[model samples]
Target chain A: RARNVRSHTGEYAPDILVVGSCFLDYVGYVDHMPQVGETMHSVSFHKGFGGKGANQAVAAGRLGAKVAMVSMVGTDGDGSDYIKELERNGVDTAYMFRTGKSSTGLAMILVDTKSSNNEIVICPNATNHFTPELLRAQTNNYERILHTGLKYLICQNEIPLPTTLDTIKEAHSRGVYTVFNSAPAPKPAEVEQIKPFLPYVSLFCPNEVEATLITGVKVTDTESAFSAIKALQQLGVRDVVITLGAAGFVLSENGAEPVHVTGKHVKAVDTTGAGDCFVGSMVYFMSRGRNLLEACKRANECAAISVTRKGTQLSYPHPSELPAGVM
Target chain B: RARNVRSHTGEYAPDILVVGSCFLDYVGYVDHMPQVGETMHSVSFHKGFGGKGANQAVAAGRLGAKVAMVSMVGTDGDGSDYIKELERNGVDTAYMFRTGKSSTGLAMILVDTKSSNNEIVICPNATNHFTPELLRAQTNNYERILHTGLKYLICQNEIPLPTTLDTIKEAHSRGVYTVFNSAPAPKPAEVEQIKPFLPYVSLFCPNEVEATLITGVKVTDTESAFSAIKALQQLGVRDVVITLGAAGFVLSENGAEPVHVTGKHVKAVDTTGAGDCFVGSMVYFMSRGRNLLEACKRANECAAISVTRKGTQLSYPHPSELPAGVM
Candidate 1:
């Protein structure tokens, strides 16, 4: 059973863990890109608090994970609002830090008319400060123990790579399981440098493009997908999954063929942050000892629900209200 | 001579012509588009305020246009702040309407890294109620005419197409010669119906893409550009200009060969309202009797200065600071 936690107005810790970056997302709309010497009007525009780490934490809490977030936000209004937002979504944000100058972070996004694709730019504001010491500061505040079936630990790419690696390495040392949805694709040269951290990553998930980037494999079909997953597994990633849009997703483990988990197709209005919902969903179910395959199904269900709506964590459905059987 | 109108903060019709279609724009970002049956995560994020009309108004006001805005703003804090922002930028809000239930309109934008373009969804909110009756009410309360040798009547696409036509038509009836930077390119069906409004449209400005959509002519070189201009002119437009990024702009009139005014290459951080700045500059200069070619050159300078910085009106340069020879 998951404990209910509200972020904005109050605070409390929960069993599940979320670790990553925080940000203030900025978005703009355009008919098309401005040519070298020309300009086009912005069709629409807005600003919102968003980042992979915070987004995943919010998604997990909404989907009924005993969510605990480890991240940073600035001292600005946006940062304060982010804390309130996390609390509002039932995520435990006690470990989140407040900083000066740099905003949590910011991304400039462009969503196309079809709603299927986008263009984005990022400035990782204060996310670089999520050091190992920061994680150590809040490690003991929670009630979970290593062997008592502690919930899964979740993290992503928006935070400093070193902090992410060290925090996960520390959690694994405590017998904690971790899911690292490594995205924005780790640079090739840094993959080997990231190998030692892989052993602690219980689940390594990436979408098609990121999988191709990470493994240097052309992942167009199932065979290529398997090759990509196997490559990660060889790097000590225990459970590796490749997300293929519309068609389905491919999941694999050591000495086993990949299992294709199909998803429900629907008219998608916004695809942003659907994958974050999945990682959070996986943490939600896997923390309860649901088998890995069952966890994948829950992720698919959560993601489909995400696309049917708009925005990021705002669209993620609460676990109690989610449509039945998608999980 | 163009009058340098003077009025204190509380008085004066305001220098900028801050037109409005009250709304905000939003954009979303994530590492990947979700798979059919799986979820993904946000690696980063971004959001900003934009509605083509709102951006144009702000852009003009920021550049030292003594703007007098005509629109409705919600009673919400966002609306309050928007008004404050206008006041801060020297815009006159004496004619703005305040609505209780009307949300300022909004757009949801999604961005993809694979393509630099954007995806968007819009909701009109209070802007939909901006009818000709409302315009009459706003105009009746005006202590001063907004267009005594009006430098610009900045507008955009979010408001109902009919509302735009009506407003411009009213301006024409008042003997104001105006430039219409028709953007978000209206549908062909709309263009055909709205063609009659072009007799009042002294200048029609379109980016390369909008030119193709509105005129059905591929704008590859000066000849193609001329044809596109001719197409719009044939529809009763007096002068047509196509903005070609970096290569410059192509301007065409009834009896003259098209003239190409090249753009100065500059790195742009946030290309928010460069076009609106250009249109405002063109109007400010043309109102002083500068020829079409001179207006195009002045517009290029204003746009160049705009792309060198960030944000919309925040980047517009004042008329006094412009390089010599333009006036």
Candidate 2:
């Protein structure tokens, strides 16, 4: 049974608290990646709100999780909308800060029309200004919330490495379930810095390329993904999930044998925010007392539904929108 | 003989001073506009710098005119780059302000693949905060420049109507040449507000649609264009130039014969910033003591060359790139 919890402000504590970055995503659907000197015209362009943390939180919130977001935004016009977006979806943003130091984060996303592949360049701006020192300065307040009602601490690599590590370490010490999504495939130097935090992570999630980058095992098939999972387990991660686009994901818990699950075959309109939807749905299902295997199945369905649509937040499904048997 | 004049700090004052808006243009090249529920994949997507003020300033600056820009940018990251872009092209931005009030402006542009036509939606953000009060507070300094060596005061309608009117009234009171580009198509009420300033305007510039909207005349051909010019003259405008895209432009000077100038016959790649380029080139030539007719010819050539490329500033050609006969 879930225990009642209260936040630092004497409000109801959130079930999942996401500490990471947020951005106004400018997504462009293009024919292909342009060569250095070449310019290709895009067929469609959209401006939407996204960032791993924002997306995941919205994902869980839409799936009925009691969620809260902690981040910073510039004192510009986009800042207000960012706050309202979370509030509209029932995500508590009392900890979100608006500062004059830097502008809101932005992401220039280019998706290939033919292959549905995507490349992104992010300017963290204000998001980048969120540092471990800043978090440490609010240690006492954050500690109270961390110790009180937070069940899961969802984090991503979009923020500074040290900040993510610091937050993960604090949450783990408080006995909160720590779910780490190793995105953007960290560089060798960054990977080295993140190595120590692995032992504390309750669940480690990464896409195929990210798995290869972190474990030095190319995840082309189930065998390679299993090897990568084993490597992560050796490094002290309690659980692992390696997401392979159309092939679904591979999952392994501390003592269980690795299991491979194939994904649903569907025509993907845009696969841009699929992975974020997956993470969000998985967390929501787990919070509802479902096991990893069952959560993965439901998460896969949520992601499959998301890929058939466009835009990030627009693509995420509400519970009623889910396919039959997915719930 | 033209005398050289320096700005407040003893630097050369620009021949033309542009008080305008700047935005990061997010352009998507699409096969066609999507239906209500349909999602269309884009052929290409590009991010470029644009805005009537920025484009016109760059247009004149590229034509070898000494230009200065007065504008505000959000303290966000896009603001710094906007300053760098103008400086790179030799446009002095000494009067520019960086504010924490709002983010830099943005425009989402859609370019049709089959038609090469485009549509845009602008979010003024920081640019909206550039109010008449803001400019009024800076009057003593702006007046010093306006009263001295500044030959032309270029203004656009992208900003608040009152601010543009106030700036124009001030520049005109100081006997400075005023060039007004009534763009984005002002509403009927705004046209009523702008009528009072027409007599002070040395040159009133507007595209065909804007001219029709302002004067309530359909400018389909040369005959209707003459009526539009006559209506503008009746409103106290001394001179009028109405651009008709591929149809070129119509020129009228102080009750003189209406001259119809045809545009160059060339396939247009992107006609986004063509009119701004034409305005910039026209001002550059006029500053060099060329006659109005001669200036229009050069301006047409500049615009013709610009449409063969893409983006705003990226599409505008330097003087060196002009065709052999045109120069």
Candidate 3:
């Protein structure tokens, strides 16, 4: 019953389409986390709407991409507020589904200033209910198949496994450029979750922990990172980008020599959502016809901006707020 | 160990002290609660916070009784603001815990405006974690055995039942007055959870459903209510009070005919915390040596006043705000 709006060009369609989990990020800072028997007093906290997938879509939209987000959120005030926030940020949210029984997915993050580290716990909420039918309903509206048959399909593991595969396969058959970021931690049983969809990816992005899980290579040094990226390429991945947090990144494709691209270092308040920021902005820029290296360059800049701030999507800068080089 | 400072009359020691809960509440309306495949937009929304434990503690404090809250709330700006709020309102939150891990608990309420009915899903946050250790540690500083020894240790199921039972039993062993609002609804499991402490209960207050659940008798009318109350009396209850929501309530004791207490009717904006308001006033008045029926009458006035206004604790009238004849 849904319809897609097509560009007048009638060739490749979407500039960027995000698919994955949606969440309301509730964050705060305490002098210290609670001790076993003593109640420690905290001085500050903050609450905002955010989820990896939604944050990415918002970041893409803010960066001037015509973006569509596919996901499920709750029907409560928090979820509705997220919808309004996405609309205000210029992301197409008309296709998003709202679950009534549950509140939107939530991430409770605790920031410890003394340690400068954050401990986070997520309540998946309705994000677990996202299904292929949800994605199929939105696909009805596409005017033209992307060059890869679909324009751009970007996904993350924050959502359920089956839906991710469904979205990936749908976009790939339509010639879409597919990009994936494997985050948090990986479930081996769920590795097959992304395996079927891997052949469609134009780029596979993973951080150190995720790369280790996928490739089983101990990324103890820069050399191991290259080996991990190479292992991904040997597995039919055309391009692999391994992010090394503060150290930088390793990029490889096919049989080419891996290239080390260093990112600008910045003070991190909470590194929880920075990788998603990088991936979102990177894909947004690339969908406009930029090459992989240039996209990575832009991604690094976005990540730099994200680290200096706090929170999730709230920390991702609007296009206008970006510094000269980032834009 | 946690410590408490209390002003005493030097003769009789206090038995039990209550805490605080909901001070803000919200009412939101949407179209049809949303079908699985469809989303309904919100029609309207309103905010308020009110609950029993919170009002009861505030009421006790206002009546010159010492009270303290053991809660975990946001360390954010809202938390700071609420601290000043409780202080000004006469509730002591100095012992309340704060952590960055969770914002204070929140309830997402969906209203069917035409019917004045609602469905709510609550996030318990730090409130759910209040265990017996918290009470034992905090109540240690009070001399004269304090309220901790009261045979009537009162609380409702709004909090986690185990902790409530622990506090109830701890007081029971000391022959303190144990009162329970066994109000709202009866979780029969809660009856078993606190069974050992019931012999110490001076009063077991139930509304219609609770009475029905306890006695397994339908309270279709006043006569049924009397029979149901008598059943609980036979089950070892010292006395029983069945509140009739808007119609007021009836009081009964062993071999005594029921005393009907009629309440003044008031058009209500929100019936959110009306029953809690009544319980709070009842406890505060009872502590001052008023008989049960008289205390329930005072509580009825407080409950009537609460429904005519907005919010939970905000609607709780100051001693000066008490209408004529309420005192």
User: Which of the predicted structures, 2 or 3, would earn the higher TM-score when compared with the native?
Assistant: 2
Q: Model 3: per-residue lDDT, tens digit, A112-227?
A: 68876554545676787787665555455332222333457788888887777776766766767778887655689777566656777778898888888887897855889999
Per-residue lDDT of model 3, residues B1-327, tens digit only? 122333455333343356434433334464444322221334554544445666666655554544455455555433444455555656556456565665666554555666655544444555655555654565573223334434234677666676666655555556666567764465678656555555555677778887787778898667788888777777766767888888788887544788878767888776656777777777777766777888899888888887888766667766776777657
Q: After superposition, how far is residue B126 of candidate 3 from its true place, in Å?
A: 17
Instruction: Return the lDDT, model 1, position A327.
Output: 41
lDDT of 1 by residue, A1-327 (tens): 022334442334466777787776555555654332233445655556578887888877776667767777666445665677777887876667767655556665554454534555565766766666655664552322122445577878767787778767767777777888876677776566677788888888888877877777878877788888888888788888777766567897554778887767888887778888877777777766787778787788788888898878788887667877654
Q: DockQ for every model, please.
A: 0.04, 0.05, 0.04
Better model by lDDT, 1 or 2? 2
Model 2, span A102-137: residue lDDT tens? 667766566676875665545566787788887666
Among all windows of 10 consecutive residues in model 1 chain A, the one with the lowest summed lDDT is A1-10
Q: What local lDDT score does residue B195 receive in model 2, on the 0 to 100 scale?
A: 89
State how far residue A225 of model 2 sits from its true place (Å): 21
Best by lDDT: 2
Estimate TM-scores for all models.
0.55, 0.58, 0.55
